[PDB]
């Protein structure tokens, strides 16, 4: 019936205040209640605010809802922002149908930089029985998320056969993984293989040998 527009992402510091906006395109924002949901990555949504400004039992009073007539918008204010508030926040209203905003991803800054840890694994004897070999590189414990992953074979770059996942948050840090697919004959025949990650101007690497 109308759209609800939210900023795609907001960043803020620990203990700061943020105001997350939700603008109705057509019709007056006050003509139908606005509700707000929090969703942590990989989890179901939970209600933070309903009926414009009401809090479910259990939601901190750091959270509060309001309606701004002049900008035709609803606002979720979060005071004294905490690390656990990092989440996607969705607004919701209705008229002749139910409308959701696109969600605002809130990030809470302040966590210190952390360099990646690598773990590498050779092909299993069971996989080699099948004439296949998958080299595994696990990348963990790093912040911020931006990383480049690359492989090397007897010291030289190897790009064919590489599959790398984008980083994802786990707890307060990120993880990612990368796989190098080789012929079992390709694995047995080399002297070594290497996974190298570049993060914040640093390289971290580990090698595998048959």
């Amino acid at each position: 019936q109308f759209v609800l527009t939210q900023p795609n992402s907001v960043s803020t510091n620990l203990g700061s205040t943020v105001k997350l906006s939700c603008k109705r395109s057509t019709g007056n924002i006050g003509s139908n209640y606005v509700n707000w949901y929090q969703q942590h990555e990989g989890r179901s949504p939970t209600t933070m605010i309903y009926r414009d400004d009401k809090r479910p039992d259990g939601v901190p009073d750091r959270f509060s809802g309001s309606i701004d007539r002049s900008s035709n918008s609803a606002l979720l204010t979060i005071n004294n922002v905490q690390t656990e508030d990092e989440a996607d926040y969705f607004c919701h209203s209705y008229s002749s149908g139910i409308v959701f905003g696109g969600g605002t991803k809130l990030t809470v800054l302040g966590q210190p930089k952390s360099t990646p840890t690598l773990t590498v694994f050779p092909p299993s004897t069971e996989e080699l029985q099948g004439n296949k070999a998958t080299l595994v590189c696990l990348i963990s414990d790093f912040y911020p998320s931006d990383v480049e992953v690359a492989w090397k074979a007897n010291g030289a770059p190897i790009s064919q056969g590489v599959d790398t996942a984008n980083p994802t948050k786990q707890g307060n840090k990120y993880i990612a993984s990368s796989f190098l697919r080789l012929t079992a004959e390709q694995w047995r025949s080399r002297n070594s293989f290497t996974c190298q990650v570049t993060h914040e101007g640093n390289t971290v690497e580990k090698s595998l040998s048959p």
């Binding site: 309903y50 139910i98 959701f100 998958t134 696990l138 786990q170 993880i175 796989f179």
Partner: protein, 209 residues
């Protein structure tokens, strides 16, 4: 307290149908409307369908286009989303939700629906072996998502990282790892337990040095 338990999703071919179920408890079911809402990483939450408390009024989102039907069975405290004429764009996580007049007060855990011409493929599972030691399990070449991985049937809970999968040539691959003290591996076996529901696969692998 309120419980909403979804079932009935998984893989389906284009043009075919699926029926999702939400079994509810913890409130007087017949006093409240119920709803379905879906999510895609690209398009956020999208309302799909609602049904009145009494069951005799239904409402549908724009993307349904006369293809889905929502129903409820108050005697079984369950409601249902019958999804017909399915298309690739219907691949999503589907949540059921309870209403409280004007908002959704509780949401289910969500079930994945994948609309694809590809058949189910069960994973191959391979142990990964090299103070502390990190062991792993490679879950190779499966379709569709999800899989789950635990360690010693849940007895090993801290130190577990299960890594988001890569997708190549139509199949998913992931790794899970567990970090334990050296003494654990020398004192008892360490086993990964992999499940792939879409293929009714359940596999236990001991980690051998």
């Amino acid at each position: 307290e309120v419980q909403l338990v979804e079932s009935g999703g998984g893989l389906v071919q284009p043009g075919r149908s699926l029926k999702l179920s939400c079994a509810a408890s913890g409130f007087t079911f017949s006093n409240y409307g119920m709803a379905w809402v879906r999510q895609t990483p690209t398009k956020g939450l999208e309302w799909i369908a609602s049904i009145s408390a009494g069951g005799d009024k239904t409402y549908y989102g724009d993307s349904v286009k006369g293809r889905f039907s929502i129903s409820r069975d108050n005697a079984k405290t369950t409601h249902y989303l019958q999804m017909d004429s399915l298309r690739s764009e219907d691949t999503a996580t589907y949540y059921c939700a309870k209403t409280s007049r004007v908002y959704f007060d509780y949401w289910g855990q969500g079930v994945m629906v994948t609309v694809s011409s590809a058949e189910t493929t069960a994973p191959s599972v391979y142990p990964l072996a090299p103070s502390m030691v990190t062991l792993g399990c490679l879950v190779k070449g499966y379709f569709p998502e999800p899989v789950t991985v635990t360690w010693n049937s849940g007895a090993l809970s801290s130190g577990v990282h299960t890594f988001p999968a890569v997708l190549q040539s139509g199949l998913y691959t992931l790794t899970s790892s567990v970090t334990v003290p050296s003494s654990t591996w020398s004192s008892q076996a360490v086993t990964c337990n992999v499940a792939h529901p879409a293929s009714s696969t359940k596999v236990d692998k001991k980690i051998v040095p």
